[PDB]
Amino acid sequence: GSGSPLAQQIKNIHSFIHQAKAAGRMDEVRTLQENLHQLMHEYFQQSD
């Protein structure tokens, strides 16, 4: 594929984590970290 949709979502969530910290919303940071974790599982597949 040429869209790299998951890489784009990862980049966005990364940015959103810094923004939530800057807003004083560490609660939102936690949820976004969980979201980033899931995306990393989708993107970085464990493989032989």
* Positions in the binding site for Co ion (CB under 5 A): 48
- Smallest CA-to-CA distance from 29 within 11, 8, 13 is with 13
Q: For residue 21, which amino acid is it?
A: K
Q: Using CB under 8 A, which residues numbered 12 to 31 contact a second copy? A: 14-15, 18
Name which position in 5, 11, 26, 30 contacts a second copy (CB under 8 A).
Answer: 11
| Per rule CB under 8 A, count of chain residues that contact a second copy | 17
The answer to whether residue 47 forms part of the interface with a second copy (CB under 8 A) is: yes
Which of Co ion, a second copy, none does residue 27 bind to, with CB < 5 to 8 Å depending on kind? Answer: none
In whole angstroms, what is the distance from residue 13 CA to residue 3 CA?
17
